[PDB]
Every structure is written in structure tokens, then in C-alpha cells.
Amino acid sequence: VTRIERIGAHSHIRGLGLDDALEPRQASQGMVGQLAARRAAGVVLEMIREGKIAGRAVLIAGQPGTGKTAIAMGMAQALGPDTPFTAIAGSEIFSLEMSKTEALTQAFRRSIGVRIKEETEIIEGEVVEIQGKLTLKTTEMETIYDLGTKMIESLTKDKVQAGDVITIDKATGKISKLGRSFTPDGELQKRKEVVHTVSLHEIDVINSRTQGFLALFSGDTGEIKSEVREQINAKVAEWREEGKAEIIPGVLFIDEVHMLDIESFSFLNRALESDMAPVLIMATNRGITRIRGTSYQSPHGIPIDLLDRLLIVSTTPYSEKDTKQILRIRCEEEDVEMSEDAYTVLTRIGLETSLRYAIQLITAASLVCRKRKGTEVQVDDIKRVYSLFLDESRSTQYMKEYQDAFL
Amino acid sequence: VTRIERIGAHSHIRGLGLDDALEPRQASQGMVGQLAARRAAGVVLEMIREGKIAGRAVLIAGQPGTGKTAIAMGMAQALGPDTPFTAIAGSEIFSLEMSKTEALTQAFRRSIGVRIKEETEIIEGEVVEIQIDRPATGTGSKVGKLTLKTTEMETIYDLGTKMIESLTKDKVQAGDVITIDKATGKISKLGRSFTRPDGELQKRKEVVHTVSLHEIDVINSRTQGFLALFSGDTGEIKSEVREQINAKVAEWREEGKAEIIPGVLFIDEVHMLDIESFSFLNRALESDMAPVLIMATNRGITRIRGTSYQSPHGIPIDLLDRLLIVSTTPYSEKDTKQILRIRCEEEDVEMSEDAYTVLTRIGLETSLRYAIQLITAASLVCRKRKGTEVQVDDIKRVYSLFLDESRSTQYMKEYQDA
Amino acid sequence: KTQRIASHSHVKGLGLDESGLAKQAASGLVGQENAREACGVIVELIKSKKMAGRAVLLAGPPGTGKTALALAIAQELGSKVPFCPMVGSEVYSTEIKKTEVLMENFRRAIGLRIKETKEVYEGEVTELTPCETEGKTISHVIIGLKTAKGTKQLKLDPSIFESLQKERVEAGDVIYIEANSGAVKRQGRCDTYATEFDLEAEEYVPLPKGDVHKKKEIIQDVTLHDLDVANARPQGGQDILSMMGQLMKPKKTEITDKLRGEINKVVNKYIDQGIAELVPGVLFVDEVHMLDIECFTYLHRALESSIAPIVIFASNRGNCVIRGTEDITSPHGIPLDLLDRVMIIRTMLYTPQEMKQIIKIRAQTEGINISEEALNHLGEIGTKTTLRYSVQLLTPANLLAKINGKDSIEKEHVEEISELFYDAKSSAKILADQQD
Amino acid sequence: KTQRIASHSHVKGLGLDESGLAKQAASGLVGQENAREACGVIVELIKSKKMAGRAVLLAGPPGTGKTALALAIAQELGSKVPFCPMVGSEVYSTEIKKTEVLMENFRRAIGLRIKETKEVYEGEVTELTPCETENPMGGYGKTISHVIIGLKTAKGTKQLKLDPSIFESLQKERVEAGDVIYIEANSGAVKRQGRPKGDVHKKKEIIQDVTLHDLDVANARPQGGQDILSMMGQLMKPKKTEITDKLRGEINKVVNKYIDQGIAELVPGVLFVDEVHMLDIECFTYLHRALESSIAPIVIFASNRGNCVIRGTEDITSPHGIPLDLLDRVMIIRTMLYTPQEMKQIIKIRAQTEGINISEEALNHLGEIGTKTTLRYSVQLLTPANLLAKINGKDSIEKEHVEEISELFYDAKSSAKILADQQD
Ligand SMILES: Nc1ncnc2c1ncn2[C@@H]1O[C@H](COP(=O)(O)OP(=O)(O)O)[C@@H](O)[C@H]1O
Ligand SMILES: Nc1ncnc2c1ncn2[C@@H]1O[C@H](COP(=O)(O)OP(=O)(O)O)[C@@H](O)[C@H]1O
Ligand SMILES: Nc1ncnc2c1ncn2[C@@H]1O[C@H](COP(=O)(O)OP(=O)(O)O)[C@@H](O)[C@H]1O
Ligand SMILES: Nc1ncnc2c1ncn2[C@@H]1O[C@H](COP(=O)(O)OP(=O)(O)O)[C@@H](O)[C@H]1O
């Protein structure tokens, strides 16, 4: 029994620990350090929970290894279930059959949700043929349903047998399902009040003729721009005036924004100045990089025009003392115990090498611990794994040969 | 009257002459000279016809005008019938419809083949039929009878009720040749020309049909004809070919029902190509099922397309180390006149020995291909002169009118454009 | 019928001892003990299934044979764990974008394992008149099956009866039936005439042998990619004349919101019911340094996902210009961002003393034994230029040895064929003269 | 009525003597003796049909009449030999790959002559009933796959049987009693709404000249006798690439099957590629094997520049925009530059076809101004001078007219002198 959800780099943390005073705990949900980044992330996260404004952009800055993606994934789980969240890489918007504006526009639209309350009754159960009156049977109770001449001609063409579970809805819906008994639940007469949270794909069902095809894949190219505004904003606007539906804001995350086309940066101007639009959490891992397509030098590889539309939150590298603590937190992931002297060698390696390498040293060493038939890892184990796998800084020294440079 | 088949540049040679001791003849099957490349072509040719190994790459290198392509043409003509041979160009894999990788592995797909041994029952002979089945009072079987005669013997048996529809659709007359098949297909011949009688009274036709790897297409596509006649859409979906195709071909192989026959891939002008294709050739050859390919590169060291680095022989070291290079030497002065003579015999041209001497000097000063272009235009001038033999004056005037690149290089002093 | 020694068949996998140490020469693999243990850890990582999204790296000069070591990694895990290679040149596609291609590969690695009991009912079909009847329809099917081993009767539903009536079915015909409800039907499969003529055509086959009911245990593993592509498309065919020619199969990019969530939920339910068991895949990437930088920035974010399987990378060249940057250079042709977090495995060239050993293993694998002199001279030619030159020269030496009539290879044959086939180094020496 | 005066419209032949000598002034073509004598062997090469796959490159200064000479070759070979002009920029296409256009150029160049004997049945249509539907198996009621349709003609009435697919195809179109409907063995539907001499049964031999490429496109997509294929006939595929085995192997095999019977006859074509120095290097790479092909027709090229940088290389430069490997395969032809005397003559020869009477003094002045800058300018100054002569009422062109016309329009070289003043 192995679920699809598995242990991973960002999968070990669940939720973002916060307090009423917005004071980040020392160790909360597997997160240690970055008190300023966690506090500011809690402020902008509260801004997401309030939903008083739209079209905001937050850019976090810092050195590689400060947990930029870990903060975004931490805020994603703390947003709560049944809420739209869209996190896309900078290369996902590129498409040959689709325009560069279509992917970003749909990225802004798909994050905004709509809550609609509809009350519909559902009568579902078994079927018993009696000669036209069908007796609906369920585990809890059984009732008799009389039928006229309207549904007889419809059931003669359709395939209906005794024992099959049928679901009929007062919406006048008809759904035929398998028996699922020899191979239902509840009551036959029930009044169901259900709140259906709907995404912004209403633009796609109104634009397209059928939503079944385009619901399972990206499908069609860029939709007409006038339909997204006049018709969609008109219907949603009237729904806000009537009070039937309530739009719920959402989060849109983009990682590695340092490399992007200038067209996207020019479109983000109107994207942020648009009436409705989700907040933007941006993560740039490079201080100064030339924007692709032109020759320029700007901070965070972004134009100076869009530079003032982002709220930058700086981060600090983790201290050597906190590395042992977060590694102790990572020890609980695989349920593998380490000796007290092993954290000194592992942290010592993590000082001169990247942190993720030390994250892989424990998991890689636990397998050799299994080969040693021991119940706990040893210093010789991690010292052997360090000889088996070496850091980039160590492998660079052995590249001084340059036998074939391919130059 | 004539077959209307025009002779090309490499159409002059037919087959590849070889010996049991691997000693190349002076002139064998049209090939003259290049004894080293002849013996090497015999080694790789025997290895290909062996079929014991697959996935090996052989590269041939030579200067322009050394006859490097004609060797591969002789290997293709001497490869034998019913042997799949794929010939592609380095620029042909570039397409806007499909990716270059899918086109390359599509050529690798077309190279390999599968032979399946099946047996069916096919009736051969004339048809003598009297049809009473058309009129009927009610509904009935309307079987009737049938009478067939063959040079071996004659057979008389009733008509089929299921095939009477195909008999009414197709043209059936007295003395007409029609072959009924177990597949319930329609195959007939002309009975008016033969009768103004062949086959046996009862005979089974067992034919082994070579099945190309295109079966992946009909398996993936809804219809086999559309994507077989034209490219249509792109290739098959990923992970489908290995799972369904490798599983099915795994059920065909080792069970004795079918065998795998590796093919030969031929790429032209590989010197200019993108590094992605060069990287895909290595892993494509390292795959379990790969054809034995031969590639020809005329140019020397040249920068590969896609990068600013100049690789040796216009190919990176990764692909160069993966295959063996066979270098070809230019034609000797003694072999040049022999090539001119065999081209005279192939093109039915009669030239004087002095024309072979002067034209041989032209072959020493200029490339042999230019001389092959001079003799063709000189034969027509000989036709204008009405003589039955070409003269040195005619081919000299042809050399005066048509100027070689090396001769026309000195005429660029006009500075018409820059 | 014959394996034909496809590619290199001498690799049976690592085959290391239970103590954990690696032999000098084991299972045809010689040397690379540090790489042997390095690749011996990752196979235990895959067999443990504790982590998802791990990254492996093979760093070595061209010709060290790390791809064959990856094949040993694939053979050690067995046929249970799905393993497929991905070349760096297949990411670029006209119809499908590169991001959707790489995503489809990450969905290709992981797979599901379903244990199903196949019940095969095949034989002569004798259809009895249905007993149930009355507002009439069918609602009950009674079909008899008669084989030389015995006769049985099977009751079927009217839906399967319509599935049979879709094709041509007649009394006394052999039909195959599976628990999947798929039934292969052939009109007139039994051998009979009764019409006085043999022209009925169709297929004339004698009565099959074996029992009617066949109970088997078949465990099928289906990759999640085929499930996403199969469920995303209507996957219908031959039910309409116009639609089959209308659909061009553009293979458009799937959406992550609906499809990944739906497939994830239904697979979670199927594995929670105990019907299916999810197994991780292995991704082996070649020429990783030749991908575009967008495939890198999408690649690290893609592997950082919890649902991403373990991926293996290989660096065939040293420091080179990054694809698409044209300016910034990075070691191993990979940027410093993705070069981090990926484990590094050292691969070193073999000493000349192993040349004759590897050539000997390839010789005994091909099935031809060579003399000690041909092994010494051929080994000297191998260590003089490259191992691939001698390994590829092993076959033509046996070919010429067989043509002359000798049962074994001699130094005159290998040294004679070495002059006919020029190595890439000597061919590069003859060139560069700027001639012709 | 009006030929639009393309300026290339007046030609007859190369004007070569029966012994092979090039006449000074023949068929309105004066000059380029080496070019015409060089093409006299080319027209015999194309007329001989024995050799194929040989390319001839034309080189010379701009305006030497190489295009008009190639047109004179196409007109000398006759209307039976197809001539397809093309430029290096035409091969670029979004739907078609770059190599497929050059690949099919050899197919559209080669001509074919097919004699198709067809039977036609015409007359007044009289129908009885349609084909009834049938239940699955069961033998039904028979009376299927037989269509009884009578035809009434002036010679007589004859009843004919037709297949169910034919009547099924005619059911979509409007069918009434007493209408003339043409029936052929090709399953074509020809009807006349609102409305027959000769016998009911007819047979005729239709000789059609079809290029190979037309058989390629028509072979890839059928005429749409079927319903779905007719829907594909209504919705046109933008383009599709044909496989090599279908484009070459199969069609060449069945063509060879038509050759041995003697009914169909194949004729070689002429492929004219102009401005080849702007063609990409990839079309040269494929053009190597395209020139090495046995069935490839003779190709003619034109180079308007002495030396150019090879497209896509950005570094290596080559004469005539062609690589040396490909330049060795083509046969170079050098064209002589025109003298002012033959310019003064060719201006008057051009004025003859134009239908404008020009005095000798104006011809001399046009020869002077043509020698000063370019001949093409004096060619373009012919019409405005005559129009001004018609406006002023003069019967013929005068030196003052060409002086005013030459004064209004600035020369290209003079404009080049006025250009680059570094203003605005
Ligand atoms: N404060 C933290 N607490 C726990 N884990 C962290 C923290 N910061 C980073 N990590 C871990 O470090 C790993 C690598 O982070 P990474 O994505 O490289 O950060 P960045 O994107 O800022 O370079 C992540 O998987 C994350 O789980
Ligand atoms: N063995 C041979 N005998 C006769 N002619 C040959 C031979 N080899 C090559 N040729 C001639 O060379 C021409 C093709 O040369 P090619 O292979 O293109 O040279 P390269 O490979 O140097 O470009 C053909 O027209 C053919 O007539
Ligand atoms: N440990 C080993 N012992 C013997 N031969 C090996 C070993 N590893 C690899 N090889 C040989 O190397 C070949 C594969 O090399 P490959 O991985 O393609 O080189 P590269 O990685 O440079 O492309 C195989 O044919 C195999 O015989
Ligand atoms: N020898 C000639 N005889 C008759 N007309 C000629 C001759 N040479 C050139 N011309 C005329 O010159 C005009 C322009 O020629 P052009 O096509 O520019 O030559 P090229 O193709 O060599 O550049 C043509 O319309 C043609 O009628």
C-alpha cells in the first residue's frame, strides 16, 4: 500500500505555523529560521485571506538555498483545502500552438474562484420492475415510484434492468450507474443543499461549445479578449449585484522569474492594473541577469518599470546551529535515527557544501545502514557515502584534466 | 517501345563485384579502382548480409570527386532483393510538421523489418459459370453450380452463398481468370487475352510476406492508408511503441511465428547537421533493435550546425568514436581513362583514343565529374557533325563553351557584385 | 528465434555479493568499483520506495561505458519497476510543447500494478433460445460452449450480447471470451460444410483443443501516462465513419488542474480498495547538457514535486556554453542551479590492463574465442587509441578469420584489418591539410 | 486581344542555323552568341531524353537576357514539354517543409501523356424503385445491389443496371424523371436540373497531359466518391508531405506498368530555378542527391551575383552563392556583355513589337543614355515618350520628348549620387 503522495523535499512540511501576534515559532510544522520571511509571508498571507484588494505582486530576494520555494509551498498548504492555487514554472507558459499572452492570462484567470450556492434534490437508488411503476430500493428503506407515459418511451430505448443503481435529479438529470452491490446509501427522498465552488473556467464553457473536451486538457488557443471582459465580467458583475455568487481570491505563484520574455513583463503591467487579478508571489534566484531577447543589465532580471510593482522581502542564509535542528527535523521523515556524533559530521559537511547535499547524505547513508544490518547509522557510514558521492565543489577540482573539452 | 528509363549518375554501375578471397577486381560490376574501399565494402556488406549482429555504425570519408557515394550505391544494388534499404538525406529530416528526432527515429523504424510466414488457400484457374440464381419466386439460397477447368484437371462444385455478392459485383464471364481467396477479397485477371488456362485443380499458395515496421502506424492510427501514403500527423505517442509494440513483437519473436530482419540506413551530407541529431544517433544505435547504417561525408573538418565549435570531419568526437571511418583515395590517372571508357560503353558513346588522352588530362587538371559532363555535351555535338565517332576538336569546342569553376574563377575580375 | 546479440548482452546487472562489496570483475562488468557501489545505493533507494524526486548524475569522459552501467541498474531492479530512457533530442516537438513532453515522461515513469484473474471462455458457440422474456428486450443470455475436453453453459448479459451481435455471429462458431468482456469472434470458425459447397470462404479451422474455462493469474502494470492520455481523450474508435477520419490526434497539452486531480483521486481510491499497487519508475536522461535552459528551470521545479519519481542524468562532456544562453558557461553543460541537489557519481577511464579483459568478455559473449596474440595486439591497438575502436574491430577480425577458413583469430588478421578501418584519431590526422 | 506586353512575350526560337551557327540577328534575339550556341546543345539534351539529372547554371551581369533565353528554350522545346519557373524564395512555406517543395518540383516538371478510354451512358433517366434497407444477416428480401435505370435516347431506349453505391451517391443530388444525366465508369455524378443524340453506350479516347505532381496530390487525396472522402473534399487539407515510397516507388512502379503497355508516354520536364544565390544551404544539401537522382529532370539555375555568403553559414563565402561541391556538379555558362551598338539595335527591335514608330535620332539618344547608365532605363523610357508624343499631337517620338521624359525621372545612379547627403 503506497499512496501517490510520497516524502519529498518540500513534502515534509504541512501548513505554515502562525500565531495571533504573527510571531513565527522556533520550530513550527518543520520550519526553523527566516523569522522576517515567515512574518512578512504571514502578512501577505493575511492579505490573501482578507481579499480586500486585487492585483498585487510580492517578490522575495535572497541567496540560493534560503528556502524560497519552501515558503511558497508552506503558504500553499496553509491556504486551506478546496481553494484554487496555481503555481507554474517560468517555462510552462511557453507553447508553440498557443500565444505567450494566452498562457499567462489563463494563469491569472484560473486562480480566481467563484462560490455559487445551488439547492437541488437528488433521488438515487436501486430499481425494481413491477408491471409502469418502479419500486426504488435502498439499504435504509424502500419506496414505490409511479411512472406515467412520458418516461416509458425514454426507458424503452435506454438500457434499464432490475438491480441497477440509478440517480435522477430534480434538475431533471438522468444518470445510469452500475449496481456496485454483487460486484446504495442514504435515503431515496432527500433535499440536498450544496455549495459548488466554481473556478473561472466559465469563460471556457461559454467560449467553447462543449466543456467536456476542454475540461480534460488545455485545448483551444487564446479566447476572444472581448468575451473575457464584456460577457464574463457582465455576468459575474450582475451576479455580484444580485448576491447569488461570491468570488474568492486565489494565489498565483511563479518561480525562477529571472529568465522571461520582455513581452510578459510588459503584459504584467495591465495584468496588475486589471480590475480582477490574483496576488503574485515571485521568486528570483539570481541578483543580476540579462533578460532573454535583449541586451540589458537590471536587478532580478526584470525591467525597471515592473521593478516598482513588486514588494521584495529579503532573506538570510541559515546559521550553522539551525542546520542541525532542521536536519533533526528531516530525521523524522524516513524514521531513521542518527547518532549524536553524526550530526557534527553531517553539519560540518553542510557548512562547506550545499544544504540539499547534506539532506541527501542521511537518506543515502540509511541504505548503507540497512546493508550493515544495523538499527542506527554510524559515522563510518556517512564518511563512506561522502566518498561515494561528492559535492559539486569537490567534483570541480577533478575536472582540471580537460582531456576532451568539446571546444 | 522503349522502357523510358533515364540513366542517372550512379545508374551506370550495377551490383558490387567481390571475390571469395576478398580481392577486388580491376573492373568489377562497373566499379573501377578503390581496392581498399572495395574490400571494406565487401566486409561490411558480408556483415550486413550475415544478419547476426545489429546496431553497428560504419562511416566513409573521402574528398569530393573520389566516388564515395557510388560505393554505397553499389552496396545498395548488391544488397539483394527483399532486403529493406532506407536512404535519407541530412537535410530531409528537417520539417515543420514533425520534429527532427521523430523523423530520424522514423527512418530507423523504416529501416528494420519483420518477416512473417503464413499459408493461405488460393484458387487459380478459369471460371465457367451458369447463373440461375437471379430469378426466384421466393427467398432462397440460390446456390447454383460452378464448373472450373485447369490444365492439370477440372473441378465442378456449387457456388457459395456468401460470395455470390462478390461474384455479382465483379465481372464474371466464360473463360475469365478469377482467384477466390480465404480472406474474401477480390482478385481477378484478364481472361480474354489468355483464352483468345493455368494453375492446378486444387492448390494452396504459401507466400512469406515481409512486414515492414510500419505496423506501428496502423496500430496507432485508425486507418493504415492515410498515414502510409502521406505523412499526415506526427509520430506515435511516447511509451506506446515500447509497451504495445515491444510487447507484441516480443510475442512474435522467439515463438517461431516471425523473424526480425535488420535493414540498412543511408544518410547523405551528414557534415552539416544539428547536434541534437548527432546525440540521438548514439543512443539510437545503443538501443536493442537498431539497423546497421552507413553515412557519407564529403567535406573535411567543418563547424557543426547549432554551435560555434569546429569539430573534426564535421562530426563531434562522440559520434566519431562510435563508428569506424573508412577513407577513400582519389582515382589514379590510369583508372580515370577506364572510367571514361566504361561511361562510353554505358552511354553508347564512341570516342577516339586521343579524346581519351586529352580528356584524361582534363581529368588530371579538373575533377572527373566535369569530364563526365563534357562527354555528354560532346556526344550531341558529334551528332551535329553526323559522324559516328567523337573527335578531339568537338570535345575541345565543348570545353571552350562550357567553362569549369576553376576556369571561370579568373573571370570574376569584372566585379559585377560583392 | 535468435536474440542476435542485440547491442551489448554481456551485462546481466551488478550481481554484487550480499556483503555489499563490489568485485573487480562481476557479471561482465570490470572496474568502476566506486561507480558500482554508487549505482548500488540508488537501486536500494528505488527498491525502498521511501523517497520520490531523487536525482542521480553520472560524470565521466566519453567511452567509459556509463550507459551500460545504467543498463545494469535497469537489470538489477528487474522487469517490475518501469524503466524507460529519454534522450535529450526528443524533448523538442512541434505538436507537443517541451514542458508537456517532460511532464508526460514523468507520468511515464510511475506505474500501477493490478493483479487480475483472467477467465477465458472459448469454443464452439451454440446459442439457446433465451428463457427470460415478457417491454420485452432480452435481459438474459444463455450460450453453450462445446470443446473436445467437455461442454459447459454460460449465461451472459444483454449488453455483452449486443457486443457479440455487433459482428457476424452464427450457430456453431468458435469464439474467444475474456473477463474484460472482450470477445474475439470469427464467423464459421468450426469445420463444417452442410451446404454441399466449399465456397463459404470465411475461415475453415478444426475444432480447438483444451478446456472451455481457463483460469489464469495475470498481473498487468500500466503507466500513468497511458491513463492520462487515455482518459483525457474519448478513446473511441470504429463506432462512427465520419469521426475516425475527422480526428487528426493533435496530442494537445493536457491541463494539470482537472486531469491530474481526477487521475490522482481515482488511483488513490483504487489503491485504497486494495485492487492496485502503485510502483515508482526510473528515468534515465541522456545528453542532459544539450537541453534548453527552460527545460532546466522547469526540470528542477518538476523534480522538486512530491509526485515526481527518481531521475538519472548523465554528463557526456565538460564545461560548455549553456544552450540558449550563448554567453554564460557552466561546468558539465548544466547551470549551477540544477547542478546542485543532484548526486554526482564519478566515472574514470580504465587502465590499459583491463582492455584485454573487456575485449575477452565481448569475445566470449559474441561466441568466438581469440588467441592470446590477437588479444595482446588488439589490446595494444585498443589502449593506443580507444576501447571502442578495438571492441568494434572484434567482429570484422572474426569475419575475415572465417572467410579465410581459420577457426580462431590471429594477429595477422587483426593487424591486417586495423589498416583497412581507420580510427577517428588517424582520420583526423589525415584531414586538416585543407586539400581538395 | 491585348497581350499586356510582358516584354518577354515576343520570341520564336534561339535562331540557330541548321548547321549549329548562331545568327547575328534572328527571331528578335541579338547577341550572346556563346550563350545561344551553349543552349543549342541543351535543347538537344532535353529533346534526346536519354540523359537526366544534369544541371546548367547561367552566370553573368544583371540584364544579360538569361531569363529571356531560358524562355526561348521553353518556347523552342514546344508546349508539350512542361516548363515550371521558380525562385529561391518560393520554397519557403509554413505548411510545407523546405525540402518537400524542391522534392516535388521534379514531379511537377516531368510531364506525362495518358490515353484514357472511357465509356459514357447518356439519355433520359427512368427509375423504378430505390434499394431497400436490410436487417442484419437473415438473408432479408434480396432485391439489393441491383439498380434498374432505363435510358431514352433518340436512337432508342435501353435499360441498364447500376451498383447500389452509384444510386446512393445520386440520391443526395436532385433526381427527377426526364432529366439528362451523364453516367460514366468513373462513378462521377453529372446531372442537369430543369431539362441526347447518339447511341446509349459510348466509348471515347481522351488524351490528357498530366504532370507527375498532379498525380501525386490527386493520388494522396481521392476525388471523394465516398461520403467521408467527399467531406474531405469540402474541407481542404492545407498541405501534406508525401512519403518517399509513395512519391517514388509506388507511383513510378505503376507508371512503369503503364509504359510497357504502350498507352501512356512519359516526357521529361525542365526545372528553372532563378535567384539561386538566395536559396538556403539545406536545399543545396538535398539538391546534391536530387541532382544525383536518375529520374530527376534537367535543372537550370541563374546566378545574378559574382560571389555571396552561403545562407546559414554566416562565415564561409562562395562564388555565385553556391557551394563548391554543388558548383562542381552544375555546368557554368558565361554570358557576354552587350555593346552599345547592339543596344541601339535592340531598342529598335523592341520598338517593333511595342508598335511604336521611333525616329533614328531618338534611337541614338536612347542608346547614349542607355550606355551612360543602364539599358533597362531606356527600356522603361519607351512608353512615356510615346504617350507624351500622343499628348503633344506628334506622330512619332522626338529627341525633345525623350529629353523631357529623361529629365522628369531621375536615374538610379544619379539618385544614388543625391542619396547619402546626411539630411533628415
Ligand atoms: N526554514 C526552513 N525550514 C525547513 N526546511 C527548509 C527551510 N528552508 C529551506 N528548507 C528546505 O530546503 C530545501 C531546498 O530549498 P530551495 O528550493 O533550494 O530554496 P531556494 O528556492 O530558496 O533556493 C527545500 O526542500 C526545503 O524543504
Ligand atoms: N567505380 C566507379 N566507376 C565508374 N564511375 C564512378 C565510380 N565511382 C564513382 N564514379 C563516378 O563518380 C560520380 C559520383 O561521384 P561522387 O560519389 O559524388 O564523388 P564524391 O563522393 O567525391 O562526391 C558518378 O557520376 C560516377 O560516374
Ligand atoms: N564495467 C564494464 N566492463 C566491461 N565493459 C563495459 C563496462 N562498462 C561499459 N562497458 C562497455 O561499454 C559499452 C557502452 O559504452 P557507452 O556507455 O555507450 O559509452 P559512452 O557512455 O561514452 O557513450 C558497452 O558495449 C560495454 O561493453
Ligand atoms: N539577346 C536578347 N535579345 C532580345 N531581348 C533581350 C536580349 N537580352 C535581353 N533582352 C531583353 O532584356 C529584358 C530584361 O532582361 P533580364 O531578364 O533583366 O535579363 P537577365 O535575366 O539576364 O537579368 C528582357 O525583357 C529581354 O526581352
mmCIF file of C-alpha atoms in Angstrom, chain A residues 98-211:
data_model
loop_
_atom_site.group_PDB
_atom_site.id
_atom_site.type_symbol
_atom_site.label_atom_id
_atom_site.label_comp_id
_atom_site.label_asym_id
_atom_site.label_seq_id
_atom_site.Cartn_x
_atom_site.Cartn_y
_atom_site.Cartn_z
ATOM 1 C CA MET A 98 -0.514 28.976 -28.046
ATOM 2 C CA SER A 99 0.468 32.614 -27.680
ATOM 3 C CA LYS A 100 2.627 33.790 -24.791
ATOM 4 C CA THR A 101 -0.214 36.043 -23.607
ATOM 5 C CA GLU A 102 -2.791 33.229 -23.534
ATOM 6 C CA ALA A 103 -0.913 31.081 -21.014
ATOM 7 C CA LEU A 104 -0.286 33.966 -18.612
ATOM 8 C CA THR A 105 -3.847 35.274 -18.980
ATOM 9 C CA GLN A 106 -5.286 31.840 -18.190
ATOM 10 C CA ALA A 107 -2.783 31.641 -15.328
ATOM 11 C CA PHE A 108 -4.319 34.814 -13.884
ATOM 12 C CA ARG A 109 -7.920 33.745 -14.536
ATOM 13 C CA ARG A 110 -7.740 30.154 -13.268
ATOM 14 C CA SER A 111 -6.635 31.243 -9.779
ATOM 15 C CA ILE A 112 -9.739 33.381 -9.141
ATOM 16 C CA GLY A 113 -12.590 31.272 -7.777
ATOM 17 C CA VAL A 114 -16.362 31.716 -7.639
ATOM 18 C CA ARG A 115 -18.663 30.349 -4.927
ATOM 19 C CA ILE A 116 -22.209 29.546 -6.082
ATOM 20 C CA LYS A 117 -24.950 28.170 -3.819
ATOM 21 C CA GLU A 118 -27.490 25.917 -5.550
ATOM 22 C CA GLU A 119 -30.153 23.794 -3.840
ATOM 23 C CA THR A 120 -31.004 20.631 -5.794
ATOM 24 C CA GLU A 121 -32.608 17.384 -4.647
ATOM 25 C CA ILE A 122 -31.135 14.031 -5.693
ATOM 26 C CA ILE A 123 -33.149 10.795 -5.707
ATOM 27 C CA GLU A 124 -30.919 7.773 -6.334
ATOM 28 C CA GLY A 125 -31.322 4.088 -5.596
ATOM 29 C CA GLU A 126 -31.996 0.630 -6.954
ATOM 30 C CA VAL A 127 -34.713 -0.261 -9.475
ATOM 31 C CA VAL A 128 -37.397 -2.962 -9.259
ATOM 32 C CA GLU A 129 -39.592 -3.641 -12.291
ATOM 33 C CA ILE A 130 -43.299 -4.014 -11.480
ATOM 34 C CA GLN A 131 -46.000 -4.164 -14.154
ATOM 35 C CA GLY A 132 -45.400 1.449 -15.252
ATOM 36 C CA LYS A 133 -44.409 1.654 -11.585
ATOM 37 C CA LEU A 134 -40.808 1.083 -10.489
ATOM 38 C CA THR A 135 -40.002 0.242 -6.862
ATOM 39 C CA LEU A 136 -36.839 2.024 -5.720
ATOM 40 C CA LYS A 137 -34.954 0.039 -3.075
ATOM 41 C CA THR A 138 -32.141 1.130 -0.763
ATOM 42 C CA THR A 139 -30.346 -0.375 2.216
ATOM 43 C CA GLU A 140 -32.011 2.001 4.686
ATOM 44 C CA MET A 141 -35.561 1.964 3.274
ATOM 45 C CA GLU A 142 -37.582 1.118 0.161
ATOM 46 C CA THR A 143 -40.259 3.155 -1.622
ATOM 47 C CA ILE A 144 -42.541 2.789 -4.645
ATOM 48 C CA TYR A 145 -42.351 5.301 -7.507
ATOM 49 C CA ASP A 146 -45.163 5.605 -10.047
ATOM 50 C CA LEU A 147 -44.310 6.465 -13.653
ATOM 51 C CA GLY A 148 -46.504 7.893 -16.397
ATOM 52 C CA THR A 149 -46.297 7.581 -20.163
ATOM 53 C CA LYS A 150 -43.543 10.192 -20.595
ATOM 54 C CA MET A 151 -40.607 8.237 -19.147
ATOM 55 C CA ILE A 152 -41.698 4.839 -20.513
ATOM 56 C CA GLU A 153 -40.761 5.726 -24.097
ATOM 57 C CA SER A 154 -37.422 7.035 -22.810
ATOM 58 C CA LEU A 155 -36.674 3.905 -20.759
ATOM 59 C CA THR A 156 -37.600 1.565 -23.626
ATOM 60 C CA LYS A 157 -34.692 2.846 -25.728
ATOM 61 C CA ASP A 158 -32.293 3.146 -22.788
ATOM 62 C CA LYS A 159 -30.913 0.050 -21.064
ATOM 63 C CA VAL A 160 -32.509 -0.372 -17.624
ATOM 64 C CA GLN A 161 -32.555 -3.615 -15.631
ATOM 65 C CA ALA A 162 -33.645 -4.589 -12.137
ATOM 66 C CA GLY A 163 -30.949 -4.033 -9.520
ATOM 67 C CA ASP A 164 -29.096 -1.225 -11.306
ATOM 68 C CA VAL A 165 -28.386 1.926 -9.304
ATOM 69 C CA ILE A 166 -29.988 4.942 -10.999
ATOM 70 C CA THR A 167 -29.558 8.594 -9.986
ATOM 71 C CA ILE A 168 -32.324 11.012 -11.015
ATOM 72 C CA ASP A 169 -32.044 14.701 -10.122
ATOM 73 C CA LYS A 170 -34.824 17.278 -9.725
ATOM 74 C CA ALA A 171 -32.674 19.325 -12.119
ATOM 75 C CA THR A 172 -34.234 16.705 -14.444
ATOM 76 C CA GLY A 173 -30.903 14.908 -14.593
ATOM 77 C CA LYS A 174 -30.656 11.228 -15.504
ATOM 78 C CA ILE A 175 -27.550 9.206 -14.613
ATOM 79 C CA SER A 176 -27.245 5.429 -15.004
ATOM 80 C CA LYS A 177 -24.596 3.674 -12.911
ATOM 81 C CA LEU A 178 -23.517 0.107 -12.232
ATOM 82 C CA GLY A 179 -25.139 -1.866 -9.436
ATOM 83 C CA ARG A 180 -21.952 -1.892 -7.323
ATOM 84 C CA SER A 181 -23.612 -4.392 -4.957
ATOM 85 C CA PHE A 182 -22.992 -8.009 -6.016
ATOM 86 C CA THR A 183 -19.841 -6.930 -7.875
ATOM 87 C CA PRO A 184 -26.705 2.409 -2.309
ATOM 88 C CA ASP A 185 -26.511 4.592 0.810
ATOM 89 C CA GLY A 186 -28.587 7.330 2.387
ATOM 90 C CA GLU A 187 -32.264 7.868 1.619
ATOM 91 C CA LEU A 188 -34.296 7.995 -1.580
ATOM 92 C CA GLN A 189 -36.167 11.208 -0.697
ATOM 93 C CA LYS A 190 -33.621 13.848 0.311
ATOM 94 C CA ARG A 191 -33.240 17.621 -0.038
ATOM 95 C CA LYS A 192 -29.574 18.452 -0.632
ATOM 96 C CA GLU A 193 -28.145 21.943 -0.104
ATOM 97 C CA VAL A 194 -24.703 22.003 -1.736
ATOM 98 C CA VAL A 195 -22.315 24.926 -2.222
ATOM 99 C CA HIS A 196 -20.480 24.387 -5.516
ATOM 100 C CA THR A 197 -17.153 26.210 -5.735
ATOM 101 C CA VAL A 198 -16.625 27.055 -9.415
ATOM 102 C CA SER A 199 -13.363 28.214 -10.977
ATOM 103 C CA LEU A 200 -13.130 30.805 -13.762
ATOM 104 C CA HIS A 201 -13.415 28.103 -16.453
ATOM 105 C CA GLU A 202 -16.904 29.532 -17.056
ATOM 106 C CA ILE A 203 -15.084 31.592 -19.693
ATOM 107 C CA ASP A 204 -14.075 28.279 -21.277
ATOM 108 C CA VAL A 205 -17.548 26.720 -21.166
ATOM 109 C CA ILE A 206 -19.146 29.902 -22.536
ATOM 110 C CA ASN A 207 -16.485 30.320 -25.232
ATOM 111 C CA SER A 208 -16.331 26.648 -26.211
ATOM 112 C CA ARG A 209 -19.346 24.720 -27.455
ATOM 113 C CA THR A 210 -18.678 21.814 -25.065
ATOM 114 C CA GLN A 211 -16.752 21.848 -21.786
#
